[PDB]
Design a protein around this ligand. Sequence first.
Ligand code: CLA
Ligand code: CLA
Ligand SMILES: CC(/C=C/C=C(C)/C=C/[C@@]12O[C@]1(C)C[C@@H](O)CC2(C)C)=C\C=C\C=C(C)\C=C\C=C(C)\C=C\[C@@]12O[C@]1(C)C[C@@H](O)CC2(C)C
Ligand SMILES: CC(/C=C/C=C(C)/C=C/[C@@]12O[C@]1(C)C[C@@H](O)CC2(C)C)=C\C=C\C=C(C)\C=C\C=C(C)\C=C\[C@@]12O[C@]1(C)C[C@@H](O)CC2(C)C
Ligand SMILES: CCCCCCCS[C@@H]1O[C@H](CO)[C@@H](O)[C@H](O)[C@H]1O
Lengths: 163, 212, 41, 207, 61
Amino acid sequence: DIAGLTPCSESKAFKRRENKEVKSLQKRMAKYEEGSAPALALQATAERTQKRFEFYGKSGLLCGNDGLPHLIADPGLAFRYGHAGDIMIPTVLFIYMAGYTGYAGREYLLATRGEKKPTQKEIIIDVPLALKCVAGSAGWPLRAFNDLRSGSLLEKEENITVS
Amino acid sequence: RPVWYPGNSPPEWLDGSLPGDYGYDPLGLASDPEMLKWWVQAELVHGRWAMLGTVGMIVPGVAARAGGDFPQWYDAGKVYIENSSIPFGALLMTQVLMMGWSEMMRYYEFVSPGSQGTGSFMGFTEAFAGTGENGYPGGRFFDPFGLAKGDPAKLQEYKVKEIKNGRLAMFSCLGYYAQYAATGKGPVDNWFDHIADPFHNTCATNGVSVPF
Amino acid sequence: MQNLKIYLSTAPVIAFIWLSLLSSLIIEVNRFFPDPLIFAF
Amino acid sequence: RPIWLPGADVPEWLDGTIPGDFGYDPLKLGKDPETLKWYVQAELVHGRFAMMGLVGMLVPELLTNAGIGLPAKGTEWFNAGAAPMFAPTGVLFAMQFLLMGWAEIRRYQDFKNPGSVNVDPIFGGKLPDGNIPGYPGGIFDPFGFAKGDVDSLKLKEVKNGRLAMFATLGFYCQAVVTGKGPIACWTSHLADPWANNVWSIELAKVI
Amino acid sequence: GPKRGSRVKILRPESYWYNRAGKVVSCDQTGIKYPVTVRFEDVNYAGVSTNNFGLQEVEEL
Ligand code: CLA
Ligand code: CLA
Ligand SMILES: CC(/C=C/C=C(C)/C=C/[C@@]12O[C@]1(C)C[C@@H](O)CC2(C)C)=C\C=C\C=C(C)\C=C\C=C(C)\C=C\[C@@]12O[C@]1(C)C[C@@H](O)CC2(C)C
Ligand SMILES: CC(/C=C/C=C(C)/C=C/[C@@]12O[C@]1(C)C[C@@H](O)CC2(C)C)=C\C=C\C=C(C)\C=C\C=C(C)\C=C\[C@@]12O[C@]1(C)C[C@@H](O)CC2(C)C
Ligand SMILES: CCCCCCCS[C@@H]1O[C@H](CO)[C@@H](O)[C@H](O)[C@H]1O
């Protein structure tokens, strides 16, 4: 299909790749009589591993010749051809994960800025003031636009330069 | 003042007026004045759940001597949902709903004592307003007999009884747990077992508390 | 208790405590929801 | 003044000025003024769609399931995705988009420049306006309310809008789970309240 | 000219405080080349918190 790939469920080497692991695993657990937890621990992993195979085959990942599932970047490809969960969705997740801690770091420096000596306030955090920021940081996309358009996000031209 | 461990002096920060203050803070966790009033409520709450828990354990136990088919406090959880008729999820999630309401209400009177009875919870002003102490709401609902209204000298004398009876209910309710995990039998069963053959039923003979 | 808090508010303490809250959480998310390649579920 | 929970804050940047204000903004989205202005309108537009929209879900399914009288074609509100007939979803959609976006850009460019969306020469004919900021009035209030109950009427719009928004979200999440219609989800609970609750099925049931 | 305690912005090209606010600790009434003395909360690379400037450079805000 896409890019000369095939869905991993209808792949073949992928099916080798799944059923070659259990063999090497089970031939190993034949050395432990069931009265041993190692007989159970190995068993539980073989059943744990097969779950993910039926998951990867189902979810529709694309395995190339090797049988290993690949991904696809472009929105116009992921979206239209149906699998965007590889990056396109989690690339939104991350930004909200990263910007949240990103923007929660900016407010704290603002709130702790005006004082007698902000320095000791950076070493020793007052967690309540940091908590009020961790709370306030949520919905940073809407709070970033506003510091952006109100003009309070940038520090403008009093920055220092050299020559 | 009759401190615990006589011959010492109380930790210098709390000598003050608290019901049942014996000067016991050997790890010094009252050292934060803002935090102390948070522990004073913490105890009062535990003391009140204790005193209800103990009776809740003993009575079904004592009820079981005459017959009358109750369970022990342990494995009374099963026996109810053994016979069920309503699912476990619906019950535990009605807990969190109704119970969480009280606690999260009980909290914002501790935070700011003014609110919670300003009004606009179904009216009920002054019933929830609180009487101003940490763990004592007072009022119409929580205090139906109108006690703690008349003579204060008699009131401060209850506030002492409540704690001292609470500190004992906790310390006993630690026994109900611990002597269940060892002997595996009810609290009043043990209270008969040791009153019958005191010598071979003692603690050293449970085979758990004293391993070999 | 005054000064025990201020120490617990030092930079390396929170750096330890708060990462060990992520680390633990991110570890256990993988306990119940194992092997998450793509967001498909 | 009523508070969301009686003991907390009423954040500094938020006083009790605007109606439907109980002092709840934990994430502190509105802080600067020229934003709070915006969101207030974003609320009402939601609050207004949600009210109307929910009745599109509620009543038709209610009729059918309240008796034989006028059974709602399209069945449950999520079974009306099907039953287009006359025009294709390709065209009928971009007819909407073009048609709505005319009216709603008119709504924005009013918020931008408050006095007149359109002064009398431009956009031939039409342009009655009679517009105060934040509420259209004019055409959009034909019976001529704002008779002196405004402040109360304002509180009654938001407070019903607040609820229909929140209640709408239930219709989504319920149907996403129980696969039934609202009155099916309704009565089945009202029938036997315990076993038919939430959190006994699929969602908190993960436990 | 400029007065003590009043805030300042510094346009001196070679400096660690160039375009950075500072508070005059003292201004001399003299003919000194560099009369004004400012003070900055920030620290230089050398660890210097104070410096002398010329009137043509210091500007008060
Ligand atoms: C019987 C139904 C009917 C009705 C109710 C109207 C109503 C109206 N006509 Mg009219 N008209 C009709 C049949 C009708 N017409 C027929 C059969 C013809 C062709 C023979 C015309 C040809 C016509 C012309 C050529 C003109 C009107 C105009 C007007 C408007 C004058 C009002 C005004 O100045 O206030 C202020 C002006 C308003 C428009 C008030 C706004 C009221 C509504 C909400 C506006 C609706 C306009 C419409 C949707 C525009 C899109 C259609 C078009 C672009 C294809 C008024 C809305 C005048 C106008 O500007 O409208 C085109 C005008 O010059 N009429
Ligand atoms: C939370 C505060 C914060 C914020 C808002 C930023 C923001 C920025 N940094 Mg940055 N940085 C920070 C802390 C922060 N940094 C720290 C603590 C260090 C190292 C001691 C660095 C080291 C650093 C370098 C070396 C570079 C940046 C760059 C950048 C810019 C591009 C973003 C990027 O890719 O960074 C990527 C971030 C990293 C590589 C390291 C960040 C590690 C984390 C985020 C620091 C921990 C944050 C802190 C614990 C939050 C406490 C919150 C609590 C007090 C409430 C952006 C302006 C880049 C730049 O200027 O490009 C324009 C760049 O080259 N920063
Ligand atoms: C609340 C409580 C008990 C509550 C009982 C309940 C709800 C009853 C529950 C049940 O009825 C149900 C629900 C179902 C029934 O079928 C079964 C059960 C399960 C039985 C015990 C508290 C029990 C709490 C106890 C025992 C605490 C002891 C703490 C001590 C001694 C601390 C001392 C210090 O803290 C100080 C004082 C000062 C510091 O400086 C020094 C140190 C040492 C740190
Ligand atoms: C508008 C809306 C729903 C509209 C639904 C419509 C039109 C339905 C249309 C249909 O049914 C019909 C008509 C017919 C069907 O055949 C077709 C469909 C299409 C199915 C929901 C809004 C839903 C909006 C919701 C649920 C918002 C909830 C917000 C909450 C809880 C709080 C938010 C906060 O902002 C505050 C208050 C303070 C901040 O600090 C903190 C945060 C959290 C940011
Ligand atoms: C309890 C685990 C988290 C550790 C931090 C909790 C205390 S928070 C701590 O409170 C102190 C009160 O004097 C302040 O001095 C200090 O600045 C503040 O960080």
